[PDB]
Amino acid sequence: MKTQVAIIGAGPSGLLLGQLLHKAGIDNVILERTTPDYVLGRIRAGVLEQGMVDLLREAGVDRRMARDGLVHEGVEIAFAGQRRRIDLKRLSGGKTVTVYGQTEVTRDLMEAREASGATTVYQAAEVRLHDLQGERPYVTFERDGERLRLDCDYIAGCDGFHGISRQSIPAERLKVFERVYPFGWLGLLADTPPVSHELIYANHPRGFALCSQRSATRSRYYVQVPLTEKVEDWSDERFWTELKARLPAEVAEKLVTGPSLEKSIAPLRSFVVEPMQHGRLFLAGDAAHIVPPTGAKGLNLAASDVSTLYRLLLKAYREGRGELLERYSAICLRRIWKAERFSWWMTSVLHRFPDTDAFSQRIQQTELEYYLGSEAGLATIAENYVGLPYEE
Amino acid sequence: MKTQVAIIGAGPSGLLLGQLLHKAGIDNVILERTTPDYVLGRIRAGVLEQGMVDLLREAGVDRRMARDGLVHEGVEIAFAGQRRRIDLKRLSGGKTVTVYGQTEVTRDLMEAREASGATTVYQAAEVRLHDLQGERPYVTFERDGERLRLDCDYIAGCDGFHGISRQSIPAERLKVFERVYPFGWLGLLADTPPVSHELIYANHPRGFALCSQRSATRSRYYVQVPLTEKVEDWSDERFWTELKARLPAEVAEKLVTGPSLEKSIAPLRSFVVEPMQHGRLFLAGDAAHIVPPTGAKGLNLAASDVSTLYRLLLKAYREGRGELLERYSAICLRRIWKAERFSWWMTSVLHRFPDTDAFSQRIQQTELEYYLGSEAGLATIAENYVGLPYEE
Numbered sequence: 027m028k029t030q031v032a033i034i035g036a037g038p039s040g041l042l043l044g045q046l047l048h049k050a051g052i053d054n055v056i057l058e059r060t061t062p063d064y065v066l067g068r069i070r071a072g073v074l075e076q077g078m079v080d081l082l083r084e085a086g087v088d089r090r091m092a093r094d095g096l097v098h099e100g101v102e103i104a105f106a107g108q109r110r111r112i113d114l115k116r117l118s119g120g121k122t123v124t125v126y127g128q129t130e131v132t133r134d135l136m137e138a139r140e141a142s143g144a145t146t147v148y149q150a151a152e153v154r155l156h157d158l159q160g161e162r163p164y165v166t167f168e169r170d171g172e173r174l175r176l177d178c179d180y181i182a183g184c185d186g187f188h189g190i191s192r193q194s195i196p197a198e199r200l201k202v203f204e205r206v207y208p209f210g211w212l213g214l215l216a217d218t219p220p221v222s223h224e225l226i227y228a229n230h231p232r233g234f235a236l237c238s239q240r241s242a243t244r245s246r247y248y249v250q251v252p253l254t255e256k257v258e259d260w261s262d263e264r265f266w267t268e269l270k271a272r273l274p275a276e277v278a279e280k281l282v283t284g285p286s287l288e289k290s291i292a293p294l295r296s297f298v299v300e301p302m303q304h305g306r307l308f309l310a311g312d313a314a315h316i317v318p319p320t321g322a323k324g325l326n327l328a329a330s331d332v333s334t335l336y337r338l339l340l341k342a343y344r345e346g347r348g349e350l351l352e353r354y355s356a357i358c359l360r361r362i363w364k365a366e367r368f369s370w371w372m373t374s375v376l377h378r379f380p381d382t383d384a385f386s387q388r389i390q391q392t393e394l395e396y397y398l399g400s401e402a403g404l405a406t407i408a409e410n411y412v413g414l415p416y417e418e
Numbered sequence: 419m420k421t422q423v424a425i426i427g428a429g430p431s432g433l434l435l436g437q438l439l440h441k442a443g444i445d446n447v448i449l450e451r452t453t454p455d456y457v458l459g460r461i462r463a464g465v466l467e468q469g470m471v472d473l474l475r476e477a478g479v480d481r482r483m484a485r486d487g488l489v490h491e492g493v494e495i496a497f498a499g500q501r502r503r504i505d506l507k508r509l510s511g512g513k514t515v516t517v518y519g520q521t522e523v524t525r526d527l528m529e530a531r532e533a534s535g536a537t538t539v540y541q542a543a544e545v546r547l548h549d550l551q552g553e554r555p556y557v558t559f560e561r562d563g564e565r566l567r568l569d570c571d572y573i574a575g576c577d578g579f580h581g582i583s584r585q586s587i588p589a590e591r592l593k594v595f596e597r598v599y600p601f602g603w604l605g606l607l608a609d610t611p612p613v614s615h616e617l618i619y620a621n622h623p624r625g626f627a628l629c630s631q632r633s634a635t636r637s638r639y640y641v642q643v644p645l646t647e648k649v650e651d652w653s654d655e656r657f658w659t660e661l662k663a664r665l666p667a668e669v670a671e672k673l674v675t676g677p678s679l680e681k682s683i684a685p686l687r688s689f690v691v692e693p694m695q696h697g698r699l700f701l702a703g704d705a706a707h708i709v710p711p712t713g714a715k716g717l718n719l720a721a722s723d724v725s726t727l728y729r730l731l732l733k734a735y736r737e738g739r740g741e742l743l744e745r746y747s748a749i750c751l752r753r754i755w756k757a758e759r760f761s762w763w764m765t766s767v768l769h770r771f772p773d774t775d776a777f778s779q780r781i782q783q784t785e786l787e788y789y790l791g792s793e794a795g796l797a798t799i800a801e802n803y804v805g806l807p808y809e810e
């Protein structure tokens with residue numbers, strides 16, 4: 027079989043890239059290691075930037091989002107007995123963020139692809155990339171015991187952190203930057219009304235806590251835990267008690283608790299690889315970089331990578347301007363590094379780090395006091411939170 | 419579940435390590451991504467060093483090998499109209515090599531493990547390593563939809579070039595050395611009597627050819643092909659004609675051809691990673707390094723890595739000398755680099771390289787003439803071919 031653009035991974039990155047391209051008349055095939063069900067079981071993201079929202083509208087998959095999504099105009103940070111609200115809309119110049127789960131975005135994209143008739147091969151086992159530096163690269167994979175070959179012009183590696191794409195580039199050609207945090211996030215999804223109409227990020231001595239949501243009757247809560255914890259050691263009962271302990275009393279007493287639909291621990295890390303392409307292979311999303319969930323940038327950076335790749339592929343196919351693809355990494359890395367710096371900053375001021383001396387604790391507290399009390403400080407959080415502008 | 423040593427991959431490396439350890443009283447669990455059948459379908463190696471042979475005897479899996487294996491005392495190199503034999507036995511000081519297929523070695527090891535009652539989990543999907551730098555590392559995997567956790571003290575990554583082990587070590591902690599050759603080997607396994615009682619490595623203007631065997635009625639032939647070739651473009655008919663064209667007439671006319679049992683193309687590469695361990699994780703075999711098949715060192719280097727790891731694990735468990743494990747990489751890398759240099763040398767003097775000027779062609783030919791005509795030159799090939807001594 028042959029196609030123009032072969033896409034590895036049917037998560038939001040690949041599906042969004044594949045929708046945009048198909049819409050523009052560029053044939054693409056998506057190869058996914060697992061099943062649609064497995065993909066749909068990942069809870070993950072809840073916060074989307076305006077740029078992600080417009081990209082979904084452009085891809086023609088925004089009906090359900092425009093209806094069910096919640097537009098948020100502010101967020102709250104609670105520390106040292108105080109609760110400070112950041113007016114994102116006012117401080118960022120009218121920009122806002124949208125709360126719509128990643129499961130929903132994925133489901134909408136999967137349905138739009140299903141209907142369009144575009145090719146999608148699930149349970150594509152043992153995917154291997156070949157002739158990346160040639161003019162005719164190809165992908166081999168196993169479907170029901172038989173190994174097929176897919177010929178293409180370009181390959182978009184949208185296979186996540188553990189995908190085959192990044193591994194297929196000669197190690198000596200990549201420079202990795204990584205930071206692993208000494209804690210993870212224990213998340214709990216419940217069918218209960220959220221405790222606030224906006225998100226509450228909390229720095230507490232016992233550790234970080236976050237009050238999020240998915241809709242008016244579905245909440246998502248998180249608490250910072252050491253990497254040595256096991257999810258089975260955390261009953262719903264234990265989670266609620268711990269969460270309550272980390273929140274302001276007035277917030278904790280208004281909390282409607284209930285049994286969990288999902289519970290899991292996500293470890294935290296920062297990771298960037300440079301460059302993000304090799305020959306005819308271009309990395310996008312988690313395949314190229316990871317940001318701690320604190321700044322809500324992962325899925326959103328996946329979106330800007332995809333918007334950039336799509337627009338460069340359009341010029342190549344439509345305008346015969348293939349030389350432009352060489353600019354992929356430079357354009358993306360600029361936005362990636364700034365979003366990494368913000369996610370790193372948020373993570374450092376909101377979490378409890380092991381082995382912290384007196385001076386550092388005081389500086390962490392002072393960072394919050396200064397940034398949340400200065401009009402200029404608030405603006406730096408707001409513009410970064412809503413999302414820095416996409417480069418052209 | 420808990421065990422002492424968790425082993426990733428049931429190829430010869432993991433099975434051999436697991437047999438040795440079990441025999442010494444150290445419990446180990448082997449996790450394999452595929453099925454026993456898939457493992458048994460890989461043809462691969464045919465030449466074993468004396469050190470590999472003694473290691474199999476020590477592991478108590480040499481009955482069938484001692485019976486069916488063919489001990490070779492010499493090899494032949496054909497170039498420029500000449501056929502020169504290297505008397506390995508005489509030039510290396512009595513050492514020889516043994517021809518016994520890797521499929522057989524694997525089958526013998528699998529049966530010995532089956533009988534011993536030692537744990538082996540096939541179709542162990544989505545294997546992930548955790549807490550490598552801790553005192554209690556663990557492995558998570560999926561077996562029939564359910565994700566299990568395996569606790570252990572040490573983890574031996576014997577999962578090959580594309581395994582999860584090497585990928586689990588922080589990229590910034592490893593320094594990769596790699597060379598990819600512009601050609602691959604098209605191999606053909608036939609149920610016919612070999613053309614010679616010894617192997618024939620041939621440098622011919624059309625490219626490299628190799629006459630090997632598995633037994634008195636089963637041969638293995640190879641011809642050098644560009645990376646752009648597809649196995650389906652090579653009929654048995656086309657292979658035999660090409661092979662015949664690359665061999666000395668007297669050899670080519672004695673050739674008994676026949677339909678193929680197996681046909682495949684293996685690309686050539688040199689690859690070394692330094693160090694070969696991280697915390698409680700130790701890499702072995704193809705997971706740590708790849709050598710072009712020309713010098714017949716891959717499986718053999720896997721054996722010395724395993725012999726070293728086993729002996730260091732024995733001191734740790736039996737003698738409480740865990741500090742010795744830190745020496746793993748230094749000991750192995752010494753043997754690896756020398757076997758890499760030899761495999762690289764063999765590859766460069768026996769193959770046709772694209773874009774070679776007149777001077778280089780003459781030097782390649784002169785290398786053969788000198789090394790095959792000097793008693794000292796012959797000895798350097800012989801001692802390296804039989805295998806350099808294992809370090810203690």
Ligand SMILES: Cc1cc2nc3c(=O)[nH]c(=O)nc-3n(C[C@H](O)[C@H](O)[C@H](O)COP(=O)(O)OP(=O)(O)OC[C@H]3O[C@@H](n4cnc5c(N)ncnc54)[C@H](O)[C@@H]3O)c2cc1C
Pocket residue numbers: 034035036037038039040057058059060065070071072073074128150153184185186187188189190211213292310311312313319322323324325326327328
């Ligand atoms: C707890 C948590 C909270 C988060 N919150 C936010 C938030 O509020 N906002 C935000 O922007 N980000 C957030 N993120 C991040 C976001 O979820 C990820 O960045 C996003 O899922 C990345 O999408 P991707 O398409 O790049 O890959 P992924 O979602 O990982 O999907 C990659 C796909 O490729 C497939 N694949 C892997 N290997 C292969 C192979 N060899 N062959 C074929 N297919 C393969 C995988 O099965 C998978 O389907 C959060 C993440 C977590 C963990």
Ligand SMILES: Cc1cc2nc3c(=O)[nH]c(=O)nc-3n(C[C@H](O)[C@H](O)[C@H](O)COP(=O)(O)OP(=O)(O)OC[C@H]3O[C@@H](n4cnc5c(N)ncnc54)[C@H](O)[C@@H]3O)c2cc1C
Pocket residue numbers: 426427428429430431432449450451452457462463464465466520542545576577578579580581582603605684702703704705711714715716717718719720
């Ligand atoms: C054409 C050719 C000829 C050769 N000739 C010779 C010869 O004559 N002599 C010689 O010494 N060498 C030779 N070699 C090399 C030799 O075959 C390899 O070095 C040897 O197979 C390495 O063994 P290993 O156990 O390290 O791995 P492998 O044989 O690759 O096995 C690794 C195992 O790990 C499994 N695995 C992979 N990923 C995972 C995962 N995520 N989870 C669990 N399991 C996983 C794989 O399924 C596989 O079963 C030759 C190779 C080739 C290709």
